[PDB]
Amino acid sequence: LEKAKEAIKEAIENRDELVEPYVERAKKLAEEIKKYVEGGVEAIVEAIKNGDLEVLAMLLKGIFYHGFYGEREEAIELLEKLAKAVKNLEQRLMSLLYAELLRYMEEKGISWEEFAPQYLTLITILLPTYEKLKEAGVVTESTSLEELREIIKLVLENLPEPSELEKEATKEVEPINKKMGEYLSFEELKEVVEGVANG
């Protein structure tokens, strides 16, 4: 809190630099998830337990965009439970980010398409905020989840309007991301997150 004001401010000025990498990464994850969908629950759990960021990022989008089809409560529960289970700080924060997007929509009553352009706006500002605070030693592996959510809600509270590139990229990638969250049911996602925690 407060100690990240210049980190977010500089993050909003460079947010559009992360638009193209996000689009490329999302298109790659859309094909890689099919390999791990055929691999099964045990293949996803073992990969994440051994610190595979890519598989963990695949699972995050699988949980978040599965909530687009309904029952966003369960996606919030799984994203927060997975955040505590994993040890990496970057994906800990990404899991909390997707949970806060769904939590903010339910508490405010915002529909998915009304808030879709703000997904990439929060991602492209919060990610350089994390890197800046990590480069300054403000956040670390011992940083509690409660302080990570304070960073996310601080960016989401002072969230600027989406940029032209973000609105453009949102239309390009939303159909891709929604198909990514159609393979793994909430029951399978429950098994994966439970497998990461104690499997």
Author numbering: 2 to 200
Paste lines from the article:
Here we present rotamer inverted fragment finder–diffusion (Riff-Diff), a hybrid machine learning and atomistic modelling strategy for scaffolding catalytic arrays in de novo proteins. We highlight the general applicability of Riff-Diff by designing enzymes for two mechanistically distinct chemical transformations, the retro-aldol reaction and the Morita–Baylis–Hillman reaction. We show that in both cases, it is possible to generate catalysts that exhibit activities rivalling those optimized by in vitro evolution, along with exquisite stereoselectivity. High-resolution structures of six of the designs revealed near-atomic active site design precision.
We obtained crystal structures of the four designs: RAD13 (kcat = 3.8 × 10−5 s−1), RAD17 (kcat not determined), RAD32 (kcat = 1.1 × 10−2 s−1), and RAD36 (kcat = 6.2 × 10−5 s−1). The crystal structures agree with the design models, having backbone Cα RMSD values between 0.68 Å and 1.2 Å. By contrast, in the active site of RAD32, the most active design for which an experimental structure could be obtained, a tyrosine of the catalytic tetrad (Tyr120) adopts a catalytically unproductive conformation. Another tyrosine, Tyr99, is positioned to compensate for this interaction, and a tenfold lower kcat of a Y99F variant confirmed its participation in the catalytic machinery. However, the exchange Y120F also led to a tenfold reduction in activity. The observed alternative conformation of Y120 concomitant with the reduced activity of Y120F hints at a potential conformational change induced by substrate binding.
